[PDB]
Amino acid sequence: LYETISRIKKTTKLLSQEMGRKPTEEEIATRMEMTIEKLRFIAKSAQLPISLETPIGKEEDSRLGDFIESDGETPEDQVSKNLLREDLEKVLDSLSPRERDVLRLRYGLDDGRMKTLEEIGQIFNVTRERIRQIEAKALRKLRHPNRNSVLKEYIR
Amino acid sequence: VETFERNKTIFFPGDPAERVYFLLKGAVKLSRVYEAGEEITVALLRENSVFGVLSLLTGNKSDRFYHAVAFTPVELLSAPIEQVEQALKENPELSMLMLRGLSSRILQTEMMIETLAHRDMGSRLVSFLLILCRDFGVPCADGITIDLKLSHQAIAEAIGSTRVTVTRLLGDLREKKMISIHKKKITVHKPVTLSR
DNA sequence: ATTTTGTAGCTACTTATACAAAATTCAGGAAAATTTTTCTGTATAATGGGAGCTGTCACGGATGCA
DNA sequence: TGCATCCGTGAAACAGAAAAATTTTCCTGAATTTTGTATAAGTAGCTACAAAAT
């Protein structure tokens, strides 16, 4: 690509000769063989990174990167969530405690998304005709106002 | 022109975006919710046409008190409450328009009325079966059938059924003479005639 | 004096079961297709770079010394 | 040997290649519904019926 880029530079400079500042791009693509999409990509592609700490500027007071955060998240989100957990928990955990297990088994509320009804049916007590019934039952139960109207605000 | 898929809801109770809508296409049946469970759909629509009277029941403070449904892949338009509020506040015709559409959902009820809660789970199932063929039916050779890809027990919501949809209908499918199936199809043979 | 209460009853009559293959879809595999990344050569001849900076200190050292 | 200086502190190449990758295809396979389908009773109904309270 380095060469392609350079080659473009020269070829585009030729365009610039006729069309000053080669404003042509897609027209340059008639000679660039590809939408400016890659031309601009090339542009960014050919960028050299920055010290993360070049002293900032308009003031030598500080380096760069000292105005951002890591891949982490603010407690504000953390908590809200964790509320969700329990909020739920109880709110679920007030209708058919056994079934509530499968609610967490065939779903989350722990660390499976899942335990495929298949495996789950037998997991709790070996079953085939007692699963998606209580499944929907559980949902529609904790669904509808007064029930689902508790996560209605905490839709997290 | 809002819409969804064959397995979705339009909304719940408690949810305050209650203005008259405009099912642009597809049934988008609405499944009125209940406490413990069991949701009629009742509502079921056509081109262009409205549903979900909300800012209209207990004023604009009405709670849907009825969960909704994106029945088939939806197609539904809506309009700023003003259309049924300010724009409606104007000439009757404006309101009348919405009222005419409301009268459609109303007519719908009357249609369910009698046909539904008739008595038998077979006659009743047919009492609105032909009706259905008159709603989303598909006429073809045999006659005015529906064809929509369906349960045995959504059907049960038609009665309070368990295997009647897959058992009794089989009768009409063959033993009794009234429809036929292509994996999940309906071929109403007829308006009346055999099986009447 | 019918009517509601009955009792002694069924039949119809309808869930319920459980299975069940049939669907019916889904996922993964497998390519295979291909796009992108690598690799290699290049023959007149070619044989030391860039810079500058030039205003405290201290100390301990300063070995180095004469 | 105290007395120099004198470390260094706190403040742009390419064409030719290939081979990778990758990646779209497939397919498939299975796994997984649904539905059909039985299934089996029991049944809760239901429908008359009967004597005895309007």
Swiss-Prot record, chain A:
Binding region for DNA: 117-136
Signal peptide (residue range): none
Source organism superkingdom: Bacteria
Positions of region (Sigma-70 factor domain-3): 3-78
Stretch list, region Sigma-70 factor domain-4: 91-144
Cellular location(s): Cytoplasm
Function in brief: Sigma factors are initiation factors that promote the attachment of RNA polymerase to specific initiation sites and are then released. This sigma factor is the primary sigma factor during exponential growth.
Oligomeric and partner information: Interacts transiently with the RNA polymerase catalytic core.
Protein family: Belongs to the sigma-70 factor family. RpoD/SigA subfamily.
Name of this chain's protein: RNA polymerase sigma factor SigA
Protein species of origin: Nostoc sp. (strain PCC 7120 / SAG 25.82 / UTEX 2576)
Whole-protein residues included: 235 to 390 of 390
Curated annotation (Swiss-Prot), chain B:
One Pfam family, short name: cNMP_binding
GO terms for cellular component: cytosol
Record GO terms (molecular function): DNA binding; DNA-binding transcription factor activity
Keywords assigned by UniProt, alphabetized: Activator, DNA-binding, Transcription, Transcription regulation
Domain HTH crp-type, residue spans: 119-192
Statement: the UniProt record of this protein carries the keyword Metal-binding: no
Binding region for DNA: 152-171
InterPro entries: cNMP-bd_dom, cNMP-bd_dom_sf, Env_Response_Regulators, HTH_CRP, RmlC-like_jellyroll, Tscrpt_reg_HTH_Crp-type_CS, Tscrpt_reg_NtcA, WH-like_DNA-bd_sf
The UniProt record lists the keyword Transmembrane: no
Function: Required for full expression of proteins subject to ammonium repression. Transcriptional activator of genes subject to nitrogen control.
Protein name in UniProt: Global nitrogen regulator
Organism listed in the record: Nostoc sp. (strain PCC 7120 / SAG 25.82 / UTEX 2576)
Record gene name: ntcA
